[PDB]
């Protein structure tokens, strides 16, 4: 759980639904990068 967390959302636009490549960026485990797409109301419902 690392703060720089709240930096992705801002950017989760640009990683799009690619969350693999944002996981890479920050280094963290699926479960913070999915949970990040699960707060964004565009990636959440198709
Ligand atoms: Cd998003």
Redesign the pocket.
């Given at each position: 759980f690392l703060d720089g967390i709240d930096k992705a959302?801002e950017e989760?636009?640009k990683?799009?639904?690619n969350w693999r490549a944002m996981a890479s960026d920050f280094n963290l485990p699926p479960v913070v990068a999915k949970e990040?797409?699960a707060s964004?109301?565009?990636?959440?419902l198709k």
């Open positions: 959302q989760c636009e990683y799009h639904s990040i797409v964004c109301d565009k990636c959440q």
